[PDB]
């Protein structure tokens, strides 16, 4: 039961979740029931679970509670347009993974933490933050009245945990390049097969990347506005890097503000476009992300003068 | 028992409440006792009521807790200089209405909510936020140990509720233009009469507008500083409008920052000056607001170069 | 048990405490044990005490919780390099004083409070905020399970309170000029004597100044970044001054932003350099602060073009 405008435009890939946090949870529950079903989860146990997650997000310009819901909607959009491809376990499992994918994020990349010699970097040699994101998740599920998979069998429960584990880790962009490249080949040869679990995890992996980056697939005015939040995080990290006696890459250097239009251009070309390209090849219904992406690419070129 | 400088300068229309929240409540209690009386309200029940209201204001650049107290002081200033015109019910009733007049405000106008298709817009077809502001008020009064009108008769209680209702709704600027225009005529013909309840509500209505806008009646340095908070709210709304695929009016368009000195000029001419003009006509003691207002008008013209 | 990079670089004067609050407490406990000893304080009672102090710091751009820890580290650095000069009482006493030295600070100088006619200004005729900082301290100690000097004798306890009292008051910069000038003479004549308690308090006094200002002794990139937080506080105060119908000194005037490179130059020359100069004269191990200070002085001159 969502407002008419929302019920209608929530099915759109480029949908924005507005500036109404209090309404954010509701928007999520709605999507679970439309994609998975009403009796997938007990309402109260779910709502309790949601509030807890909202609470374990930090007020960081970009990787915050809004990012979490936004990413999830893209997944919902992907799920609804490929409705016959996945089980409920995967559906109910993937939506949850998206909301938790950046839990307890502080706004610093894995690079900085290793430089800073942070306790977590010692704890997780690779994919430091993402491993923490999943750690946070399990802690929340282990809370009383928080196990929404209570009704699941221990077999099913373990399965959905793996799904969520694999998914969350995939939000490490460093892992993306190897994943896309592999998928690019397998698609070409025809060896690519969704019934292969090893193959299947990789698609899911690429699906997660598409969502984590979906701000490039929004309309131009949203994409441009979201951009401010992201560099806010980058430049701040650059500052802390500088506090370590370390010259940061120009991307995190606030002195190089002008360069940003080209910095984005390069990123689209090298990362974003190849990503949604590959995805539409495998999942044609996901093209609107790609089209919207290129529309934004054209805008960036239009910025340079 | 307020500091000497405060006790002295609190009687000034252009008084500013400083940056000491913790001291804000105290400043309010003081005004209730000077305008209405000590035994108007039970201290503890009042303080409890105040903290609750402070809690239900949001950290929004302008329409926040500070706005609430500031608006109330102007009313106090109006009440003290027209001391023989109103009953205690109206006095105690109007001060309370001013503090609650923007309860749970989020920083977006009624226009945006209707565009966004917000639940409240469906709930309140007209004067969406203001109806909510009064709804919030009643909820707080209905809290235990929060009914400061407990000592009032059910007749008096209902009366003061109407006063507060009517008052709060009047803070809708859309309603102002019709109200001023009517008052402008009645004053001219002489038909205007304070003993007429229909007439009486309209004055109260115009009094509320004067307070909600009183930042134009502060000294120039305060008026200029307060201005930043307001456009912060506007431009943000423009951003969200843009997120709806809707080109917002230049006032909410942050791209048109330069234009602001003229934007303010137009507003003074068309809205602010006619407002305090009419008010002084009816209530001559309220002229300092008008004088201070024009002093700020002269400053805006002085800005354009 | 701190990360390797931290264990190593925490002994450096120009050490920065990073952007990990959750890790800030730990960094403090570590320093107490390295400077004073493990059985100086009961762990739990200490941790309880720390969290309470963190809670009574305000989110003010500069004089906040980070400032508190940063100042304390400098003291630790001073203590560790002059290990044979002080008793444990003084050590355990001074580290604590540094963390509490700006408790409940709101970001306004004593000048503004007197102008504003604030309740505290009436309460404390001189060194208004600093007297409050110590008042806050005592209140926290008087909390249950918060008396970390519980194990101390009432004689020792009173002694450490005086130490803390004297120390905190010394963070009033107005008092500094008279203190340095006296120390400058006594050092010259040879009359300066650490066994003299009157003399001894003055050194401690100058040590506190060195720490409160230690942002000038950090590396250039940190010093420059910290600078933003400080003027944020100044300009805001200027704004409130203007709200009092009072033209503030150019330092708190945000209109005079350009002037800042020279404003800092003057400060170094007149205040910072003479301070660390005198300190190294008395305590040669504290020279790195001075060297780092001048390195930053050279940078400011390099700014002017
Ligand atoms: C973990 C990893 O590999 N990362 C690299 C890419 C980066 C990134 N993520 C984005 C997510 C959403 C939308 C845009 C994103 N853009 C990213 O980096 C591109 C934007 N960039 C640059 C590059 C060079 C620049 C030089 C000067 C000024 C700005 C620059 N911006 C690169 C995130 C970290
Ligand atoms: C609800 C309603 O009718 N509103 C119209 C007036 C508006 C408003 N409120 C003020 C309250 C206190 C002080 C000043 C206020 N100014 C307001 O709007 C005026 C300021 N404005 C403009 C107008 C056009 C502009 C064009 C370009 C750049 C800035 C502009 N500012 C109009 C509030 C919403
Ligand atoms: C209490 C007292 O005596 N104060 C004077 C010095 C001031 C101060 N504290 C600092 C602490 C750490 C680092 C730098 C600090 N700088 C301070 O003031 C200097 C910086 N200044 C100026 C002076 C004049 C200016 C004129 C135009 C623009 C900027 C200016 N900045 C002076 C603090 C208040
Ligand atoms: Zn992430
Ligand atoms: Zn993410
Ligand atoms: Zn309002
Ligand atoms: Zn208002
Ligand atoms: Zn201080
Ligand atoms: Zn300080």
mmCIF file of N, CA, C and O and ligand atoms in Angstrom, chain A residues 63 67 101-102 212, ligand 5:
data_model
loop_
_atom_site.group_PDB
_atom_site.id
_atom_site.type_symbol
_atom_site.label_atom_id
_atom_site.label_comp_id
_atom_site.label_asym_id
_atom_site.label_seq_id
_atom_site.Cartn_x
_atom_site.Cartn_y
_atom_site.Cartn_z
ATOM 1 N N UNK A 63 28.070 6.255 1.488
ATOM 2 C CA UNK A 63 27.852 4.868 1.897
ATOM 3 C C UNK A 63 27.020 4.783 3.184
ATOM 4 O O UNK A 63 27.474 4.243 4.192
ATOM 5 N N UNK A 67 21.956 4.933 0.539
ATOM 6 C CA UNK A 67 22.661 4.059 -0.389
ATOM 7 C C UNK A 67 22.136 2.641 -0.274
ATOM 8 O O UNK A 67 21.925 1.967 -1.274
ATOM 9 N N UNK A 101 24.896 -4.563 2.561
ATOM 10 C CA UNK A 101 26.152 -4.707 1.829
ATOM 11 C C UNK A 101 27.238 -3.721 2.254
ATOM 12 O O UNK A 101 28.413 -3.939 1.972
ATOM 13 N N UNK A 102 26.852 -2.644 2.929
ATOM 14 C CA UNK A 102 27.825 -1.662 3.401
ATOM 15 C C UNK A 102 27.591 -1.322 4.871
ATOM 16 O O UNK A 102 27.814 -0.192 5.293
ATOM 17 N N UNK A 212 25.349 -1.508 -6.940
ATOM 18 C CA UNK A 212 26.217 -0.677 -6.107
ATOM 19 C C UNK A 212 26.613 0.587 -6.869
ATOM 20 O O UNK A 212 26.965 1.605 -6.271
HETATM 21 ZN ZN1 LIG D 5 28.098 0.169 -1.738
#
